[PDB]
Amino acid sequence: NFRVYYRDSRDPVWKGPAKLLWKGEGAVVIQDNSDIKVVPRRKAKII
Amino acid sequence: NFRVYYRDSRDPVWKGPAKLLWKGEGAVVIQDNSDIKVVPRRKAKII
Amino acid sequence: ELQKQITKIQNFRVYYRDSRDPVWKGPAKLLWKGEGAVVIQDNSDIKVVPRRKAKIIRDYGKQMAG
Amino acid sequence: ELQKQITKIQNFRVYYRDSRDPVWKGPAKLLWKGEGAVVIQDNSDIKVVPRRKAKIIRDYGKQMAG
Amino acid sequence: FLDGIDKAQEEHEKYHSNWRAMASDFNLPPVVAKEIVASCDKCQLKGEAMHGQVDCSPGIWQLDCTHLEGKVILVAVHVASGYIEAEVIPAETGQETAYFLLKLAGRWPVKTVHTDNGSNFTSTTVKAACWWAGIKQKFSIPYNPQSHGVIESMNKELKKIIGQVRDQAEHLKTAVQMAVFIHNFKRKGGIGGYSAGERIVDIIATDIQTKELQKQITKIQNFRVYYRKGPAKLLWKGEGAVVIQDNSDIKVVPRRKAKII
Amino acid sequence: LDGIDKAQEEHEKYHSNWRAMASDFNLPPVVAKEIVASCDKCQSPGIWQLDCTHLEGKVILVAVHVASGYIEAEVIPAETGQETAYFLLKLAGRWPVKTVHTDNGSNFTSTTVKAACWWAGIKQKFGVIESMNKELKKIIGQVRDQAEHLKTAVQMAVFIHNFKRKGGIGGYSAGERIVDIIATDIQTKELQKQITKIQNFRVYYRWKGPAKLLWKGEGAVVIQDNSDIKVVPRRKAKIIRD
Amino acid sequence: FLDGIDKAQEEHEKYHSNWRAMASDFNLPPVVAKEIVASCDKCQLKGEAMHGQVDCSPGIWQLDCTHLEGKVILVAVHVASGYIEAEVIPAETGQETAYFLLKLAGRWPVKTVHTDNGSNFTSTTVKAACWWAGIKQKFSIPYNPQSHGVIESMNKELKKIIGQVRDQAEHLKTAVQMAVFIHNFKRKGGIGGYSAGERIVDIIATDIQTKELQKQITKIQNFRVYYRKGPAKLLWKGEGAVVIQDNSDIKVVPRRKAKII
Amino acid sequence: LDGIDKAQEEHEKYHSNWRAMASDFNLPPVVAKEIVASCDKCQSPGIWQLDCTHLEGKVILVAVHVASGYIEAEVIPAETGQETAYFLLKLAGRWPVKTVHTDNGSNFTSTTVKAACWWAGIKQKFGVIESMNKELKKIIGQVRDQAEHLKTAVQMAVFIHNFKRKGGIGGYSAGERIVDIIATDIQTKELQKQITKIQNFRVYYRWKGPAKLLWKGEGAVVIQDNSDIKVVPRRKAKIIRD
DNA sequence: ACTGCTAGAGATTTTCCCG
DNA sequence: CGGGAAAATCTCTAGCA
DNA sequence: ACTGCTAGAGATTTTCCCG
DNA sequence: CGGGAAAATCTCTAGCA
Ligand SMILES: C[C@@H]1CCO[C@H]2Cn3cc(C(=O)NCc4ccc(F)cc4F)c(=O)c(O)c3C(=O)N12
Ligand SMILES: C[C@@H]1CCO[C@H]2Cn3cc(C(=O)NCc4ccc(F)cc4F)c(=O)c(O)c3C(=O)N12
Ligand SMILES: [Mg+2]
Ligand SMILES: [Mg+2]
Ligand SMILES: [Mg+2]
Ligand SMILES: [Mg+2]
Ligand SMILES: [Zn+2]
Ligand SMILES: [Zn+2]
């Protein structure tokens, strides 16, 4: 599995670990407390 | 001689032509209506 | 018949990018066109490219020039 | 006498940049030090560098290591 | 390292020392020290250093608003060509945007529009218009303008041209139309040395024409191929390689170990 | 290169234009153009028609691209010079527009329209437009119920006319047709620019007299001397600018 | 081209068409078309795509202010090492800055300070303090932070570390001191794999020691050199090359055509 | 490599430390350290002293780096644990601080100071400081007229003491001296880390018994067997981790 | 399941053109 | 095959706000 | 007459280590 | 000399506001 940490929506605070659902080029779909988010890969880190 | 066009001090409006006085690396000294200015070479164009 | 249509296909130039490289790769020959993928020949090297990553022109200037 | 001091000089590493290149050029040997310029030897190529463009260390780790 | 590890983790709690400082100060292999970092939620602060790439298909348009002398300019760009289209609108609303979009759909083939999430773009009237014109809508990741970097960049270029010609016209609506003229027909560069106007003509005409030709080719050229498998459909052959399409998967195999039937 | 004689014979027999002679016999388009221009017996993309129509007491300005049948139309509030000027400048920015044909009304002759035409480089010259206003009105009537305001209905009609109606020889829409026509015009003006660029040189081959240059390939130099097109090697000739 | 030129200039007045569009549409050589652009004041809008390089000498410090939870943090960095120094100050004033600067001057050799033009930095009391400590002051080009990019970047890194440790302390002044600790001693990287603390020790010690050694070398090794000229002073020899200093100009000449006296 | 025997003789004669044996005879510092550590007959950078002094009714906290004579001093408003803690954490961030020697006062024994020491990894252990308070007071008296407030005078005194006063053997200032001492300490702990890193291996040469590793150069492998340092070629030996 | 880009300035390399 | 000049290509930047 | 930089993530190439 | 794994180096990014 993967832990995802991310910044999203103008909030300069990194959150996570979120579950990775999908990885494209340039963006990821992650899940964070039942809240599915779409994050640019510039703004995420997969571990 | 050289014509210098430049943007300076937060003003998004390009001015010139100014006389070039000195050219370093990264900056120029120019003269524009008796007003000597120092401008980063990123923010000037020498012709 | 078929050879004329195929040589027409191969007259179109393809500008494309690879999945991670931001520079547009110079003009390549078009071999085949799909809904999702264009097959190209770029410098004696056949490659498959997602359609979302390819600009297909004729290059009218070059054509008229010869 | 003189040779010992010169070999000490040449034990210091020089990190430097060229007038337009932003990457720091890897460790070079120090030959001479001025108020305005350090003379280096980088890969069998002696170069002169303004002092404002050079970081001169000993590399204590490398020294102790040998 | 069972001793160094226990110490490095304790110190990393207080300090959050990076992996090199922990390798140095506790005699740890890089992978072990890095493992200590990778497991600290408080040290996951930097995104990966890459950029994505936008969809450049001949049907995709990027739309945005921008602002100049207290007025709203609606801008659109055919991503493939660089060809633009802008109008001063009275207000940033879904009514203006749906009307602008209906006009654009009637002048060019518009298959997909990509926008930020400005409320004018997510409004219900824009949805109804895109539905009526057959336009698929894509919204970027919120607060990620890079997603529609093409149109953001075109806002830059349109405002710069407007500055060059602002004084030849009196009202901003006119300067804006002048600027669209200039961009689309008096500025050459990009792939074919084209102006954007010529380039979009070439893109759309090429799209039509290649579609027609490849259609006729698939109509005549009908064969099956076997390689290494099943009856894969032939797409192209020549130069000692065969391009096949097996189960909606296009692969380039050499002429050896491939027989055309 | 070797097919120039075949092309000359084909032109003498069938009077085929340069496009066919260059597509079939694999010649640079300058050479086929010279062949088709060396025979005396063998001897629109920018023209738009503007008119203002009326519907439900509102005013619609209509531009038809004559060669294509492709429409740009909208509701303007008032039939003035300012509004015509703004519509025209919009069209000029969107499509290559060289000539506008209007009906000598008050708006189409205004100073402001003439200023716009002078800025955009358009020539004003004071049947298709009537029938086409009719067609557009029919489509507006068909789609009127589909919107609340006439302007939106107008734009829907324009969408339908340009892209959802196919007729003529090849069953193309007006939008496909206009894109074809404009592409052909671009090829034509590329060719004319090429001809202009190379018509300033003079060649000397084997040294013979001054010949007119036609093409400077990678392995040859195609010239024209005494109404005859001769292929000479590059090393054997010398091109000078006059 | 006397015809094409006259037309291109007239059209460039209306449109400001770039050089390629003018070369294309008027049959002009690139240099002529580009000349038309270069002579239009309304088309001089873009600066050259380069970056300068900051002074990295062992004596230069870059100073700045930054802001966190409604408080003013004064920050300084020895540019050569990356070694920092920060204190929460009650107000952005020349009094706080002169006091901070006197302290820094008494702890490390401070030869030059480089700052933006914030009024605290240009105040008269900071001038009096720098004069008393022998500090030369440099101010960047106004509104060009890149000039002191090192310290601007260090503001970034200090705020990120403060975020990592904010909860171990109660007051921001303490978290700030913790963060300076962490940066200077618990983070390795850069040139020698050092922490900034070790690196500044090495820089300053090397500076002292090389100064002493080269002094002794110039005291003993005394010769004159002739090349190609005058009696140039010898600096270094060996490996088939001689480095001389002729009229305050250092040049590297090969051993051939050079005689040492 | 060849000078190991010369170095052994030099140590037997003069008992020279490893620094000299490695600077003169060109040996990796691990090897010279082994030689100086193989003879039984031949057998501070982090220690700071803190004290609170008084002047003109104000309170000055003073840190002396014992080895160097280098001072960090300031006026604190109150002689409390919080203020001592903040001063100490500042010093620790600025200089490698391992041990602090204080005088059992109320502030130096506070919980908050002890919390700061635990966070920074400092050890608290409850003559130079008295004489040095004296010197600092003399300099403060010399420069008092040069400022309006005592805190600025204090910082000037600190500047003068650290950088504008030279004495001792080589006529160095305290700042030069402390930079030297700390550099020496960094070399020392690099060396200890190197020794620790390589003390976990075992070598077999020519196969003989297990020898202790000392250096793994590019053209040799220096080992130690039976209190004897032997240089063997790399291909002729095999190093394993135990 | 989505994603930086554009165009100009100046430097650097490739191309061509008469020997 | 050889330089010079010219064209092409590569590298990098601000602004989009 | 002055001037972007830092440090981390991930990819790519160099180095070393037992055969 | 050959791969594998490991170390080193190169490439690129946000935030500094
Ligand atoms: C309320 C709507 C919807 C939600 O967000 C806001 C705010 N916003 C902000 C920018 C902006 O920050 N551009 C600078 C930029 C930075 C990087 C890059 F790659 C490209 C760039 F253009 C826009 O352009 C923009 O259109 C909007 C907008 O529309 N809205
Ligand atoms: C009133 C004082 C003096 C005059 O100007 C203002 C405004 N200012 C603005 C920035 C800023 O825009 N940083 C972003 C950034 C952008 C690019 C880059 F390379 C580095 C960067 F840090 C500062 O950092 C800063 O210290 C100030 C400040 O002090 N002042
Ligand atoms: Mg927007
Ligand atoms: Mg925008
Ligand atoms: Mg500032
Ligand atoms: Mg700042
Ligand atoms: Zn951590
Ligand atoms: Zn202009």
Supply the DSSP string of E199-254, one letter for each residue. Answer: HHHHHHHHHHHHHHHHHHHHHH---EEEE----EEEEEEETTEEEEESSS-EEEEE
Going by C-alpha positions, the residue among G245, G55, G254 that lies closest to residue G147 is G55
Nucleotide nearest to C20 (CA to C1'): I3
Residue having the nearest C-alpha atom to atom 22 of ligand 1: E152
Decide if G188 contacts E24 (C-beta within 8 A): yes
User: What is residue E77's three-state secondary structure?
Assistant: strand
- Owner of token pair 């003399």: H138
Going by C-alpha positions, the residue among G24, D16, A35 that lies closest to residue F192 is G24
Write out the residue range of the structural domain in which residue H218 sits.
200-240
For residue G187, the tally of other CB atoms under 10 A from its CB is 21
Distances (CA, A) of C66 to C55, F1, F164, G159, G235: 21, 12, 37, 61, 63
Residue having the nearest C-alpha atom to atom 13 of ligand 2: G145
Q: In this structure, what DSSP letter does residue H158 have?
A: H
Decide if B16 contacts G52 (C-beta within 8 A): no
Q: In this structure, what DSSP letter does residue A43 have?
A: G
- The pair of three-digit structure tokens given for residue F121, joined into one six-digit string: 């480089």
Measured CA to CA, the distance from residue G201 to residue G213 in angstroms comes to: 18
Q: In what order do the strands lie in the sheet with E112-115?
A: E83-89, E71-78, E60-68, E112-115, E136-139
Going by C-alpha positions, the residue among F16, F17, F7, F9 that lies closest to residue F187 is F17
The beta-carbon neighbor of F197 closest among G11, G14, G27 is: G27
**Type of residue at G151:** I
Cβ of G24 less than 6 Å from ligand 2: no
Please check whether residue D41 lies inside any domain of the structure: yes
Nearest chain C residue to E59 by CA: give it. C52
Q: In what order do the strands lie in the sheet with A3-6?
A: A36-40, A27-31, A15-23, A3-6, A44-46
Greatest alpha-carbon span in chain B: 27
For residue H185, the tally of other CB atoms under 10 A from its CB is 19
Contact at CB, D63 and H187, closer than 8 angstroms: yes
- The pair of three-digit structure tokens given for residue G47, joined into one six-digit string: 């600066």
Q: Is the CB of G141 under 7 A from strand J?
A: no
Work out whether strand G232-238 and strand C13-16 pair parallel, antiparallel, or are unpaired.
unpaired
Decide if E79 contacts E55 (C-beta within 8 A): yes
**Type of residue at H199:** Q
Q: Is the dihedral of CA H118, H122, H125, H126 positive or negative?
A: negative
Measured CA to CA, the distance from residue A14 to residue G62 in angstroms comes to: 29
Residue positions counted in chain H: 242
- The pair of three-digit structure tokens given for residue G194, joined into one six-digit string: 């050092």
Do F and A touch, 3+ Cβ pairs within 8 Å? The answer is no
Going by C-alpha positions, the residue among H23, G206, H16 that lies closest to residue D60 is G206
Measured CA to CA, the distance from residue F126 to residue F100 in angstroms comes to: 8
Work out whether strand H201-205 and strand F212-215 pair parallel, antiparallel, or are unpaired.
unpaired
Nearest chain F residue to C62 by CA: give it. F190
Residue H140's Cα: distance from chain center in Å?
Answer: 29
Measured CA to CA, the distance from residue B28 to residue B40 in angstroms comes to: 6
Contact at CB, C60 and F187, closer than 8 angstroms: yes
Q: What is the resolution of this structure in A?
A: 2.2
Decide if F219 contacts F232 (C-beta within 8 A): no
Strand partners, H225: H228
Measured CA to CA, the distance from residue F70 to residue F47 in angstroms comes to: 12
Task: Give the CA-to-C1' distance from E48 to L12 in angstroms.
Answer: 9
Q: Is the CB of E152 under 7 A from strand I?
A: yes
The beta-carbon neighbor of H119 closest among E14, E24, E27 is: E14
Contact at CB, H193 and E14, closer than 8 angstroms: no
Minimum distance, in Å, between the CA of residue H194 and any CA atom of chain E: 9
Q: Is H15 annotated as a binding residue?
A: yes
E216 touches chain C (CB under 8 A): yes
E132 touches chain G (CB under 8 A): no
- Checking phi first, is residue G152 left (phi over 0); if not, alpha (psi -120 to 50) or beta? alpha
Chain E positions touching C9 (Cβ under 8 A) are 210, 213-214, 217
H1 touches chain D (CB under 8 A): no
Distances (CA, A) of F143 to F59, F130, F155, G124: 18, 20, 10, 76
Measured CA to CA, the distance from residue D56 to residue D54 in angstroms comes to: 6
**Type of residue at A6:** Y
Greatest alpha-carbon span in chain D: 40
The CA G126 to ligand 2 mean position distance, Å, reads 20
Cβ of E116 less than 6 Å from ligand 1: yes
Going by C-alpha positions, the residue among A11, A8, F124 that lies closest to residue A32 is A8
- The pair of three-digit structure tokens given for residue G252, joined into one six-digit string: 């590297």
Decide if E44 contacts A16 (C-beta within 8 A): yes
Give Cβ neighbours of residue H226 (< 8 Å, ≥ 6 apart).
Answer: none
- The pair of three-digit structure tokens given for residue H38, joined into one six-digit string: 């193989």
Decide if E99 contacts E126 (C-beta within 8 A): no
- Owner of token pair 């034990």: D11
Give Cβ neighbours of residue E121 (< 8 Å, ≥ 6 apart).
Answer: E63, E94, E97, E115, E139
Please check whether residue D21 lies inside any domain of the structure: yes
Give the count of alpha carbons within 13 A of E24, CB side only.
Answer: 20
Nucleotide nearest to E75 (CA to C1'): J16
Closest ligand 2 atom to the C-alpha of G64?
26
Measured CA to CA, the distance from residue H165 to residue H177 in angstroms comes to: 12
Distances (CA, A) of F109 to F59, F65, F84, F112, F184: 17, 20, 10, 8, 31
Please check whether residue C2 lies inside any domain of the structure: no
Phi, psi of C19 (to 5 degrees): -45, -30
- Owner of token pair 């870059």: G62
**Type of residue at C63:** Q
Sheet strands (E) in E11-68 = 60-68
Decide if F173 contacts F180 (C-beta within 8 A): no
**Taking CB atoms and an 8 Å cut-off, how many pairs form between chains C and F?**
24
Cβ of E143 less than 6 Å from ligand 1: yes
Nearest chain E residue to A29 by CA: give it. E141
Write down which residues 18-37 in A have CB closer than 7 A to strand I: 21-22, 24-27, 29, 36
Measured CA to CA, the distance from residue E213 to residue E207 in angstroms comes to: 10
- Owner of token pair 């990123």: B42
Question: Hey, what's the torsion of the CAs at F127, F131, F136, F141, to 10 degrees?
Answer: 150
Greatest alpha-carbon span in chain C: 40
Measured CA to CA, the distance from residue G88 to residue H83 in angstroms comes to: 14
Going by C-alpha positions, the residue among G129, G136, G111, G116 that lies closest to residue G75 is G116
- The pair of three-digit structure tokens given for residue H162, joined into one six-digit string: 């650290």
Q: Is G13 annotated as a binding residue?
A: no
Write out the residue range of the structural domain in which residue C26 sits.
11-57
> Vertex G93, ends G90 and G97: CA angle to 5°?
90
Distances (CA, A) of G239 to D13, D14, D44, G246, H121: 18, 19, 9, 20, 50
Task: Report chain I positions within 7 A of protein CB atoms.
Answer: 1-10, 16-18
Closest ligand 1 atom to the C-alpha of E65?
26
Sheet strands (E) in H80-184 = 99-101, 123-125
Write down which residues 48-67 in E have CB closer than 7 A to strand J: 66-67
Crossing angle of helices H150-163/G94-107, nearest 10°? 20
Nucleotide nearest to D20 (CA to C1'): K3
Cβ of G72 less than 6 Å from ligand 2: no
Measured CA to CA, the distance from residue G33 to residue G24 in angstroms comes to: 9
**What technique was this entry resolved by?**
cryo-EM
Phi, psi of H147 (to 5 degrees): -145, 170
**Type of residue at D13:** R
**Total domains in the fold of chain D:** 1
Give Cβ neighbours of residue F82 (< 8 Å, ≥ 6 apart).
Answer: F110, F112
Phi, psi of F16 (to 5 degrees): -70, 140
- Checking phi first, is residue F23 left (phi over 0); if not, alpha (psi -120 to 50) or beta? alpha
Strand partners, F108: none
Phi, psi of F187 (to 5 degrees): -55, -45
Sheet strands (E) in F11-148 = 47-55, 58-65, 70-76, 99-101, 123-125
Give the count of alpha carbons within 13 A of G20, CB side only.
Answer: 12
**Type of residue at B14:** W
Going by C-alpha positions, the residue among H223, H220, H189 that lies closest to residue H204 is H223
Q: Is F225 annotated as a binding residue?
A: no
Distances (CA, A) of E147 to A8, E54, E114, H92: 14, 7, 9, 46
Q: Is G3 annotated as a binding residue?
A: no
Measured CA to CA, the distance from residue G17 to residue E161 in angstroms comes to: 10
Q: Is the CB of E51 under 7 A from strand L?
A: yes
Residue having the nearest C-alpha atom to atom 19 of ligand 1: E146
- The pair of three-digit structure tokens given for residue F32, joined into one six-digit string: 């086929």
Crossing angle of helices H81-94/G172-185, nearest 10°? 20
Q: In this structure, what DSSP letter does residue F77 have?
A: S
**Type of residue at F11:** H
